């Protein structure tokens, strides 16, 4: 048991074990199953047998996806209670009454995913650069912030001494390989637009060895700056 | 219908995505990752455990472990790409880029799922028009009637003033239909006493259905949708 537990086919014995396992440890259940769906809320509907993906989150979020759109086909908010008996039901009797049932026909697989909660400025660095472009370079003119480009968005964009377009990518932590690749994409996009004379300067307090490497390798520059 | 790799390398993921594109399956990745978005504005989410769903029509969804809505999503018709990150770009006239930079892929699942291809209201119409198809002196009163623990197709009152629950199915009535009706009947029995009848209205029913009905004190009535 690490972060993913799978049963490449479960029986009813298994599912109940796995749901409880998930409730116990606060994991996410994802079932792939041929099934049908029955809903009772404001009105009463069903969907016939078909292949669906069903996601049950620790806080009671319940989602039913079939294989086509962005939206789930049916869903239920945090705070809905989960129950099993050959069907998974999520009922919110939280003052409307609502019942969403997945009658499992054929459970292809169930996956428990013991996922950690996700716990939640560069605008101020930009302020510094506009205030005193000299932190970047002598005679650098910053022009745009969050500038839409053909293939992306550039933190600060300006023009240097020689009239070359200068792209700035601002990070506030150690700049990684990803940062450099991100900036590269912006530079290349603009190179396809204004010619070979576009500079990419990565502005951060420091950077990885890999970052420094790919920069040199790529003809791009670094500039040291602390979020004040 | 399900292919799993309980840990994939980059070699694997590319095989699996292509496998999925080829056969038109759904990819579901469980991964520690981070997310970078560029659309109207530019955002990121730090490292965390997320579920990523990639549908054959380009639907792209990123869920973390807490709300109903995905944390980031992309509509049908967005194009998918892999290089240590999965990207979905819609340059479909706004430009939008959603990137999952995979830190640690816990598992990837391909699910080769069939398209889903899509009345009892008319049966109800028949019943209100001529209650006699149910019974002599049956009065149908409500349609899609909200009840304490559910919704009743048709609800009425019989000759003797008993509450009558109708469950209408248009196909062979199964065990599930009977159980469904039972729930409604029981709910109402806890409300109005023991004198509530449950009549399953369908063109026919399983042996199991006929059984559980008899076993349960519930009735059947034969009726064909138009």
Curated annotation (Swiss-Prot), chain A:
Keyword ATP-binding: no
Highest taxon listed in the record's lineage: Archaea
First-level EC class: hydrolase
Reported regulation of activity: Activity is modulated by PCNA. PCNA increases the binding affinity of NucS towards ssDNA as well as branched DNA substrates carrying either 3' or 5' flaps. PCNA is also required for optimal loading of NucS on its substrates and to direct activity towards ss/dsDNA junction.
Cross-referenced InterPro entries: Endonuclease_NucS, NucS_C, NucS_N, NucS_N_sf, tRNA_endonuc-like_dom_sf
Annotated EC: 3.1.-.-
Mutation effect (residue 75 to S): Fails to bind ssDNA
Oligomer and partners: Homodimer. Interacts with PCNA.
Protein name per the record: Endonuclease NucS
Curated annotation (Swiss-Prot), chain B:
Cell location: Cytoplasm
Gene Ontology MF, one: single-stranded DNA endodeoxyribonuclease activity
Principal place of residence: cytoplasm
InterPro entries in UniProt: Endonuclease_NucS (IPR002793), NucS_C (IPR048301), NucS_N (IPR048302), NucS_N_sf (IPR049173), tRNA_endonuc-like_dom_sf (IPR011856)
Pfam families cross-referenced by the UniProt entry: NucS_C, NucS_N
Coiled-coil regions listed: none
Assembly behavior: Homodimer. Interacts with PCNA.
Record comment regarding domains: Composed of two independent domains separated by a small linker. The N-terminal region contains the ssDNA binding site and the C-terminal region contains the nuclease active site.
Known role: Cleaves both 3' and 5' ssDNA extremities of branched DNA structures. Binds to ssDNA.
Family per record: Belongs to the NucS endonuclease family.
Name by which UniProt lists this protein: Endonuclease NucS
Native source species: Pyrococcus abyssi (strain GE5 / Orsay)
């Amino acid at each position: 048991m690490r972060k993913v537990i799978i049963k490449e086919n479960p029986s009813e014995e298994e599912i109940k074990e796995l749901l409880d396992l998930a409730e116990k440890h606060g994991g996410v259940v994802t079932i792939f199953a041929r099934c049908k769906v029955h809903y009772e809320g404001r009105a009463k509907s069903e969907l016939g047998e078909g292949d669906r993906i069903i996601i049950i989150k620790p806080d009671g979020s319940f989602l039913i996806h079939q294989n086509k759109k962005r939206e789930p086909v049916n869903w239920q908010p945090p705070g809905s209670k989960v129950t099993f008996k050959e069907n998974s039901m999520i009922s919110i009797r939280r003052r409307p009454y609502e019942r969403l049932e997945v009658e499992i026909i054929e459970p292809y697989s169930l996956v428990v995913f013991l996922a950690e909660d996700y716990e939640e400025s560069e605008a101020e660095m930009a302020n510094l650069i506009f205030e005193n472009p000299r932190v970047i370079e002598e005679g650098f003119k910053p022009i745009y912030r969050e500038k839409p480009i053909r293939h992306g968005i550039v933190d600060v964009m300006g023009v240097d001494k020689d009239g070359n377009i200068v792209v700035l990518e601002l990070k506030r932590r150690k700049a990684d390989l990803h940062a450099v690749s991100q900036m590269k994409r912006y530079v290349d996009s603009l190179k396809e637009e204004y010619g070979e004379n576009v500079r990419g300067i990565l502005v951060a307090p420091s950077l990885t060895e890999g970052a420094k490497k790919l920069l040199e390798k790529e003809g791009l520059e670094f500039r040291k700056l602390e979020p004040p």
